[PDB]
Design a protein around this ligand. Structure first.
Ligand SMILES: [Mg+2]
Ligand SMILES: [Mg+2]
Ligand SMILES: [Mg+2]
Ligand SMILES: [Mg+2]
Ligand SMILES: [Mg+2]
Ligand SMILES: [Mg+2]
Ligand SMILES: [Mg+2]
Ligand SMILES: [Mg+2]
Ligand SMILES: [Mg+2]
Ligand SMILES: [Mg+2]
Ligand SMILES: [Mg+2]
Ligand SMILES: [Mg+2]
Ligand SMILES: [Mg+2]
Ligand SMILES: [Mg+2]
Ligand SMILES: [Zn+2]
Lengths: 38, 176, 5, 142, 209
RNA sequence: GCUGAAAGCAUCUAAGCACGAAACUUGCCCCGAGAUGAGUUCUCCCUGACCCUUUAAGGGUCCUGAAGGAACGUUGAAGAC
RNA sequence: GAUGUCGGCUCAUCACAUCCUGGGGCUGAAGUAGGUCCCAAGGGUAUGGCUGUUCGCCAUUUAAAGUGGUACGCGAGCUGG
RNA sequence: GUGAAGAGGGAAACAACCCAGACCGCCAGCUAAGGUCCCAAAGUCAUGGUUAAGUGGGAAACGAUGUGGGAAGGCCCAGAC
């Protein structure tokens, strides 16, 4: 997981989801995609 | 709120009781019970369970859908037992069932012993795979996760414990 | 005693 | 003529019992602080403790709005360097359910010898029963 | 589990056929007479009050002798308490001897340490001594700095300084029980224990386990 | 991570559950009721005459001197005192 | 009409932008060993040669020899190169 | 313009900001700024909305199916998404 201020869709399979008041990205195909806002 | 609109049928041989917010579903596979939140209103005025949001609650519509999904799975549970199949992959990976407790070998220096909850049952057709059967979809789902947690599937070779239908994205090891 | 330059 | 002033050796004091079950901590505290200071009495005097005795029951059942049931933090310093201690609302209820009321009320009462004396009339209990039946407190609803 | 009160008779050496020498502190544990039993319904905690030894009858105050008379016991050196877990019970006047430790591998020993009086920082806190030469002026073994100038402007609580050392309760944990001699009321424990010879001593089962 | 909607799917989360570190609260050790919110338990001691008016948690005389403590003396592996 | 400096010595205390130990996500992570990011301040966090030196270089160690604030902490505490 | 050479009330404390120029006395009243749950004088005041972050009670580029409102457009019971 790579943490950075800007979270975006890097590919089609990516999705943005809010879990605990923090925006993070979950990708089913490529775990490199997943990020957290911080 | 499409899920909430769809009613849930209670066929013959299934008994359902409503007492305020708590509901008790009974069937041939056992019994189940949970306490619904005050924001969801459930009625038993017909042969099908109907759901609606209680007035004054903003989350009622979204909350109503959860009750339909939860009760819909529960009625299935009492009629049929949810089944989870896990597969063991490895050179010397084996599983054994002593009853409420399962003994696994996963290359550890110590034995792995896991006890099941009262509402779950397990049995071993073969030492390379294990099957979990139960009435409640929640605990049975949790049991498999803990079973899978001991050795999550190995990326470069796939060895470990995995759901029977799981797909593992094998990755080739770095060359040179 | 002391100095400060 | 000179304005009337209350006499600490002639003031009349009566006992009350309050149930804290389901009451919001802050708004219950203000009423308790108002009563302990005697602001409701027509003979209120700033330099005389004219308040009444208050008994608080079910101190563990007080309610707090929002997410502060877990985000409310209580701070106190032991006096030693680095001796800063933390205690959330849940921890205080679990450990000492009675301190939540007194800490809230204590910060609402005046400061100084008179304020401490007024606090001494507050008697909080975690359970539903109290041993002060001899005082025959009246049921007071807030 | 319940312990016992003994006296530090001294220190001795125990030889073993294998050729190893075990330094053992000899502790004499006379009969321990229970003087009172503490109950939840009346006292709020479960414990037993015990006395050991004997003291001259001319110096037992009837407030103390009456306490002993209540339990039908002879006045001892002093009174000590031990907490009771769920499984143990005792009766007033019951006498407990050293065999209680016959099944105990490890024991806990507590007592008052030897009193060193007013001790300097070097002895009390292992402070490093400053230069004995090279120009040092009347500051060979003084504590030195004790603060950080204006910003704090004070000395923090708990600062290590010269003061009373020793003469305080100390507990030594996980002491092996070498031998129990119930025919002479003695307990042998490997290693040294706090206090001087003849001082009161409290022995309890090893809590550390 | 489980179940799972808002969003027919998906989703660790919004309702409801599980795991998770030398940090945190305990566990271990020491001080500790000046904790004036001054706590509890067990024993021990005292069961007389009167007198005055400002007649009240009043003052005073006689008798009495308990429990215990202190002081002094011999002293301590206790201690600057 | 006076707040005494660099460095050393002694004694420290706090911050976390963490050097070691602890828990994790990715890895162009086979393993061993690393890279990077996240959580974590509980403890621990070299002796010498040269130089007044801090620093630095060098020698040899260590799980590591952290970065800073505190009058570039500390001379009514020492030293005075 | 104010302080300097200006008190008083407000901004927690705070010469220069806001309100306002103290001849003396009063246990009278009405107001300014600013305020009315408690410390602490006055609304736990009456309506219609927004916020769930204790935002309010510090901070940007930038990021995000947070959530409320408004005006349009594409597809759509010839079956859309
Ligand atoms: Mg004030
Ligand atoms: Mg001594
Ligand atoms: Mg000199
Ligand atoms: Mg000298
Ligand atoms: Mg100060
Ligand atoms: Mg001067
Ligand atoms: Mg800890
Ligand atoms: Mg060096
Ligand atoms: Mg040389
Ligand atoms: Mg300096
Ligand atoms: Mg110097
Ligand atoms: Mg100085
Ligand atoms: Mg010189
Ligand atoms: Mg001038
Ligand atoms: Zn992606």
């Amino acid at each position: 997981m790579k943490v950075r201020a800007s979270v975006k869709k890097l590919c089609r399979n990516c999705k943005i989801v809010k879990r605990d008041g923090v925006i993070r990205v979950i990708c089913s195909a490529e775990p490199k995609h997943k990020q957290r806002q911080g | 709120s499409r899920v909430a609109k769809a009613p849930v049928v209670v066929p013959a041989g299934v008994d359902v009781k409503i007492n305020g917010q708590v509901i008790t579903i009974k069937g041939k596979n056992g019994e189940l019970t949970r306490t619904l939140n005050d924001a969801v209103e459930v009625k038993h005025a017909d042969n099908t369970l109907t759901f609606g949001p209680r007035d004054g609650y903003a989350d009622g519509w979204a909350q109503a859908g959860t009750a339909r999904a939860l009760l819909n799975s529960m009625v299935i549970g009492v009629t049929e037992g949810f089944t989870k199949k896990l597969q063991l992959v490895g050179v010397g990976y084996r599983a054994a069932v002593k009853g409420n407790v399962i003994n696994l070998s996963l290359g550890f220096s110590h034995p792995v012993d896991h006890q099941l909850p009262a509402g779950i049952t397990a049995e071993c057709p073969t030492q390379t795979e294990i099957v979990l059967k139960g009435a409640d979809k929640q605990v049975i789902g949790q049991v498999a996760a803990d079973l899978r947690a001991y050795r999550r599937p190995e990326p470069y070779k796939g060895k470990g414990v995995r759901y029977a239908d799981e797909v593992v994205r094998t990755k080739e090891a770095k060359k040179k | 005693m002391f100095k400060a330059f | 003529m000179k304005t009337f002033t209350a006499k600490p050796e002639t003031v009349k004091r009566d006992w009350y019992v309050v149930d804290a079950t389901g009451k919001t901590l802050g708004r219950l505290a203000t009423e308790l602080a108002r009563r302990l200071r005697g602001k409701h009495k027509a003979e209120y005097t700033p330099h005389v403790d004219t308040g009444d005795y208050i008994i608080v029951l079910n101190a563990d059942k007080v309610a707090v709005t929002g997410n502060k049931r877990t985000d409310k933090v209580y701070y106190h310093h032991t006096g030693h360097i680095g001796g800063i201690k933390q205690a959330t609302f849940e921890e205080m209820i679990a450990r000492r359910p009675e301190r939540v009321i007194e800490i809230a009320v204590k910060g609402m009462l005046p400061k100084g010898p008179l304020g401490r004396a007024m606090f001494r009339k507050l008697k909080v209990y975690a359970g539903n029963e109290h041993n002060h039946a001899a005082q025959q407190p009246q049921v007071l609803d807030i | 589990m319940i312990g016992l009160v003994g006296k530090k008779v001294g220190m001795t050496r125990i030889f073993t056929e294998d050729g190893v020498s075990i330094p053992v502190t000899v502790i004499e544990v006379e009969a321990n007479r229970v003087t009172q039993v503490k109950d939840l319904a009346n006292d709020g905690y479960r414990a037993i009050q015990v006395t050991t030894g004997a003291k001259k009858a001319n110096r037992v105050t009837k407030p103390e002798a009456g306490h002993f008379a209540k339990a039908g016991v002879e006045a001892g050196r002093g009174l000590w308490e031990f907490r009771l877990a769920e499984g143990e019970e005792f009766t007033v006047g019951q006498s407990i001897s050293v065999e209680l430790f016959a099944d105990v591998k490890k024991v806990d020993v507590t007592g008052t340490s030897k009193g060193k009086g007013f001790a300097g920082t070097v002895k009390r806190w292992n402070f490093r001594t400053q230069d004995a030469t090279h120009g040092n002026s009347l500051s060979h073994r003084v504590p030195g700095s004790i603060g950080q100038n204006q910003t704090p402007g004070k000395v923090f609580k708990g600062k290590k300084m010269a003061g009373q050392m020793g003469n305080e309760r100390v507990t030594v944990q996980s002491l092996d029980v070498v031998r129990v001699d119930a025919e002479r009321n003695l307990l042998l424990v490997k290693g040294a224990v706090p206090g001087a010879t003849g001082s009161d001593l409290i022995v309890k089962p090893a809590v550390k386990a």
